[PDB]
Design an enzyme around this catalytic site. Sequence first.
Site, PDB file in Angstrom:
ATOM      1  N   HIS A   6      39.541  53.070  49.719  1.00 41.89           N
ATOM      2  CA  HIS A   6      38.509  53.153  50.754  1.00 41.89           C
ATOM      3  C   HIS A   6      38.626  51.955  51.706  1.00 41.89           C
ATOM      4  O   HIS A   6      38.520  52.096  52.932  1.00 41.89           O
ATOM      5  CB  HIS A   6      37.088  53.204  50.159  1.00 41.89           C
TER       6      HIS A   6
ATOM      7  N   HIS B 163      35.055  42.532  51.779  1.00 42.41           N
ATOM      8  CA  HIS B 163      35.901  43.597  52.294  1.00 42.41           C
ATOM      9  C   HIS B 163      35.547  43.802  53.753  1.00 42.41           C
ATOM     10  O   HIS B 163      34.597  43.194  54.231  1.00 42.41           O
ATOM     11  CB  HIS B 163      35.671  44.932  51.530  1.00 42.41           C
TER      12      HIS B 163
ATOM     13  N   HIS C  87      35.426  46.795  57.201  1.00 39.04           N
ATOM     14  CA  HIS C  87      35.453  48.140  57.773  1.00 39.04           C
ATOM     15  C   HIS C  87      36.086  48.021  59.156  1.00 39.04           C
ATOM     16  O   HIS C  87      35.803  47.055  59.879  1.00 39.04           O
ATOM     17  CB  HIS C  87      34.013  48.693  57.937  1.00 39.04           C
TER      18      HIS C  87
ATOM     19  N   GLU D 139      30.211  48.837  61.308  1.00 42.05           N
ATOM     20  CA  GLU D 139      29.161  49.703  60.759  1.00 42.05           C
ATOM     21  C   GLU D 139      27.829  49.418  61.466  1.00 42.05           C
ATOM     22  O   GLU D 139      27.245  50.313  62.075  1.00 42.05           O
ATOM     23  CB  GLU D 139      29.021  49.400  59.259  1.00 42.05           C
TER      24      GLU D 139
ATOM     25  N   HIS E 117      32.180  42.205  55.241  1.00 39.89           N
ATOM     26  CA  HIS E 117      31.010  42.228  54.358  1.00 39.89           C
ATOM     27  C   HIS E 117      31.293  41.307  53.183  1.00 39.89           C
ATOM     28  O   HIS E 117      32.249  41.590  52.438  1.00 39.89           O
ATOM     29  CB  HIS E 117      30.772  43.648  53.826  1.00 39.89           C
TER      30      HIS E 117
ATOM     31  N   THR F 125      26.740  50.908  51.991  1.00 36.39           N
ATOM     32  CA  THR F 125      27.139  51.802  53.058  1.00 36.39           C
ATOM     33  C   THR F 125      28.154  52.821  52.576  1.00 36.39           C
ATOM     34  O   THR F 125      28.648  53.577  53.398  1.00 36.39           O
ATOM     35  CB  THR F 125      27.634  51.046  54.296  1.00 36.39           C
TER      36      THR F 125
HETATM   37  N1  LIG Z   1      29.509  48.126  52.623  1.00 37.21           N
HETATM   38  S1  LIG Z   1      29.421  48.085  50.962  1.00 37.21           S
HETATM   39  O1  LIG Z   1      29.140  46.715  50.447  1.00 37.21           O
HETATM   40  O2  LIG Z   1      28.420  49.125  50.627  1.00 37.21           O
HETATM   41  C1  LIG Z   1      31.006  48.594  50.297  1.00 37.21           C
HETATM   42  C2  LIG Z   1      31.835  49.442  51.003  1.00 37.21           C
HETATM   43  F1  LIG Z   1      31.363  49.991  52.131  1.00 37.21           F
HETATM   44  C3  LIG Z   1      33.079  49.766  50.538  1.00 37.21           C
HETATM   45  F2  LIG Z   1      33.778  50.626  51.305  1.00 37.21           F
HETATM   46  C4  LIG Z   1      33.522  49.311  49.320  1.00 37.21           C
HETATM   47  S2  LIG Z   1      35.173  49.842  48.834  1.00 37.21           S
HETATM   48  C5  LIG Z   1      34.799  50.449  47.143  1.00 37.21           C
HETATM   49  C6  LIG Z   1      34.004  51.729  47.246  1.00 37.21           C
HETATM   50  O3  LIG Z   1      33.811  52.122  45.884  1.00 37.21           O
HETATM   51  C7  LIG Z   1      32.743  48.408  48.605  1.00 37.21           C
HETATM   52  F3  LIG Z   1      33.206  47.889  47.443  1.00 37.21           F
HETATM   53  C8  LIG Z   1      31.475  48.040  49.070  1.00 37.21           C
HETATM   54  N2  LIG Z   1      30.723  47.184  48.240  1.00 37.21           N
HETATM   55  C9  LIG Z   1      30.281  47.684  46.912  1.00 37.21           C
HETATM   56  C10 LIG Z   1      29.330  46.692  46.282  1.00 37.21           C
HETATM   57  C11 LIG Z   1      28.466  47.376  45.182  1.00 37.21           C
HETATM   58  C12 LIG Z   1      29.157  47.745  43.845  1.00 37.21           C
HETATM   59  C13 LIG Z   1      30.182  48.894  43.850  1.00 37.21           C
HETATM   60  C14 LIG Z   1      29.659  50.128  44.560  1.00 37.21           C
HETATM   61  C15 LIG Z   1      30.157  50.230  45.995  1.00 37.21           C
HETATM   62  C16 LIG Z   1      29.745  49.148  47.029  1.00 37.21           C
HETATM   63 ZN   LIG Z   2      30.988  47.143  53.508  1.00 38.13          ZN
END
Ligand SMILES: NS(=O)(=O)c1c(F)c(F)c(SCCO)c(F)c1NC1CCCCCCC1
Ligand SMILES: [Zn+2]
Length: 258
Positions: A62, A92, A94, A104, A117, A196
């Site tokens: 992702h 990470h 976007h 975003e 983020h 998100t």
């Molecule tokens: N913007 S965000 O912080 O919601 C987010 C992404 F958009 C991502 F695209 C990802 S990539 C992994 C998706 O499973 C991400 F880790 C996070 N962070 C994760 C932190 C919480 C624990 C794991 C569940 C997914 C969100």
């Molecule tokens: Zn994010």
Amino acid sequence: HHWGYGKHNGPEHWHKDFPIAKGERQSPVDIDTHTAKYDPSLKPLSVSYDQATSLRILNNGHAFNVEFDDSQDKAVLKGGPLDGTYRLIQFHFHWGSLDGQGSEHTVDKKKYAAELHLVHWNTKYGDFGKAVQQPDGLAVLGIFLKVGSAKPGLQKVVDVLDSIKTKGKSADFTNFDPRGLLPESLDYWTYPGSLTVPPLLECVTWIVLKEPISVSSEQVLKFRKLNFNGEGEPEELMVDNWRPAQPLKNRQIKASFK
Ligand SMILES: NS(=O)(=O)c1c(F)c(F)c(SCCO)c(F)c1NC1CCCCCCC1
Ligand SMILES: [Zn+2]
Ligand code: NA
């Protein structure tokens, strides 16, 4: 048929598996700068990254995540709108297929090329998995990227991307200092929101810095060479991995400045 960013499995589909997609505190949002109110009770953010311990970088299909040691209080965010201490676990990004899209959050409907983020969890909840179940479990620091001058502190990330081109690849990534990704000013907007991506949990205090960082065209072009697919599958460039702005609903965005 798992979730992703395509036509067939992208944001407009997520609600079928994750009905909280249509909830009351979803992210991201447009930040209307003229409606956001200055809150003199907000505190300066405290970003304490001097002892950060990066470990690894992972292409998760992702985005890519730069992961940190969060088994002690090293790299923490506090102050600002927060009560208590939040530990950095990962960052990470976007980004877009073109420079005119990829963030975003938006600012008066302006899209940036990308958005960083930095994800932190509330240490009152003991671990990251328990914190995501709580209304104040996470604090995510959001930083916009615009295309202009290179960001020197980003180059070590750009240069490892060729080793994690496809989903499920990881690489050692020690000694990376996330202070090199910050802009000069810590002025911010804040509001309560969500992850998100699925599971779209409503567990995030969002803190979005007003001042973008500049990255070069070459740096973001390298992000756009990553792949959503695994090795030995048809190539799907990792681009446009952003969720659009969601309804603000019954929320106020607060400004730390002016
Ligand atoms: N913007 S965000 O912080 O919601 C987010 C992404 F958009 C991502 F695209 C990802 S990539 C992994 C998706 O499973 C991400 F880790 C996070 N962070 C994760 C932190 C919480 C624990 C794991 C569940 C997914 C969100
Ligand atoms: Zn994010
Ligand atoms: Na430890």
